[PDB]
């Protein structure tokens, strides 16, 4: 709410050192925590780690891979054929391919409604500090 | 429509002027008779060999080899276009 409460300190010479500033580490920790907190409550895409039959998208005569795969659906006992386009950086060979990180980690889908636009955040010292 | 490469423009004259300023400020630290050269990133993962954007909800990895390159000797409607690869 209030305006920035900036108080000039006349005749004060302070020794600064950015490379040992703990504010940097605190910002890094806070930002990673917000990232995890925002990513946590949405899709987990564990079923997506399947064998993908992928071909080139081509120019119709002769970057992107047109991939197809058998995915799960609402019902446990039903499966559906899904056609999609992936980038070549997301897809690695086992023609048959898989996603890049399916042998390493579970990829969590970014929640559709959350935007990654940065917003200004101010860090304020607690009472007794400045 | 047609399949086209994601790409990024930086003004050539402005970038050359910026590199001139940076070279002057570096020559202040290394000496006034030295040669200051720029080159693309020498290795690593895609996050470090390219410039990473997260804009519009989409992630770009742009080849910054066009911004760097060239050597500075001690002595415009022209844009540098950087190919950008997108990763989901």
């Amino acid at each position, epitope marked *: 709410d209030p305006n920035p409460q900036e108080i000039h300190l006349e005749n004060v010479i302070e020794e600064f050192n950015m490379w040992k500033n703990n504010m940097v580490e605190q910002m890094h920790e806070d930002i990673i925590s917000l990232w995890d907190q925002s990513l946590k409550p949405c899709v987990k895409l564990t079923p997506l780690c399947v064998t993908l039959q992928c071909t080139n998208v081509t120019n119709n005569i002769t970057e992107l891979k047109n991939c197809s795969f058998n995915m799960t659906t609402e019902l446990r006992d039903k499966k559906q054929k899904v056609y999609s386009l992936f980038y070549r950086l997301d897809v690695v060979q086992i023609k048959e391919y898989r996603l890049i990180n399916c042998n390493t980690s579970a990829i969590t889908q970014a929640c559709p409604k959350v935007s990654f636009e940065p917003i200004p955040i101010h860090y304020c010292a607690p009472a007794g500090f400045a | 429509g047609d*399949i*086209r490469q994601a790409h990024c423009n930086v003004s050539k004259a402005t970038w050359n002027e910026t590199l001139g300023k940076v070279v002057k400020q570096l020559r202040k630290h290394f000496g006034n008779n030295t040669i200051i050269r720029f080159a693309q990133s020498s290795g690593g993962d895609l996050e470090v060999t390219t410039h990473s954007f997260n804009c519009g909800g989409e992630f770009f990895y742009c080849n910054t080899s066009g911004l760097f390159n060239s050597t500075w000797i001690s002595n415009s409607n022209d844009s540098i*276009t950087l190919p950008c690869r997108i990763k989901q």
Partner: antibody
Amino acid sequence: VQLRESGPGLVKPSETLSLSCTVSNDSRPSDHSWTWVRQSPGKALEWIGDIHYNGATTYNPSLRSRVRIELDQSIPRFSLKMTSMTAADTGMYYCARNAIRIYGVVALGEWFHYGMDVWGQGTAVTV
Amino acid sequence: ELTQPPSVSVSPGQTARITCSGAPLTSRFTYWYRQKPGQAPVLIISRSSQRSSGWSGRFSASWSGTTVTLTIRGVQADDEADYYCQSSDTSDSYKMFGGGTKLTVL
């Protein structure tokens, strides 16, 4: 667009034979690859070469050593010089435009050829 | 470098399939020209977009492997002519022209 082609017509063996082609009524000639083609009588078309306004030029291998193209850009005048011509190297010669479509950023190589859509009527040359 | 039949013969109601094959055709587009004796070639089939779409109702073509077939329906006596396939190499350094297939009308 009109491609008016001309030359000496009759030349002897072993000197340089020169051809000229005037481009008329083309808006923005710099976006097309200007090409030369030849055809001996009774034989198939033989591609000679082409040139672009940016300075890039290309030739047919095993003939490129005897051939060179110029293109005056102030007045769009499209010239060919072919040295060491032999008696058997005769027939019709045609100047033509390989129109180029751009669909993205030309600096990234995002274009393609529309083929040799406009051709000049050419000249029959005997050596 | 670019092989096509020397000639083909077709009746007025028949569709001619003029084939053209070569290694560089496995990756590059093919441009089809028609030539009459004396007259210069005229462009018949070209590339109007990165991702191909429909073309004129006549003079179509189909690609398969290293061979492209020019399908020409509704052939009449005026279409007797030498058909040429043209294509860039795999490095886009030079152009290849075919030997020409003389389409005749029975």
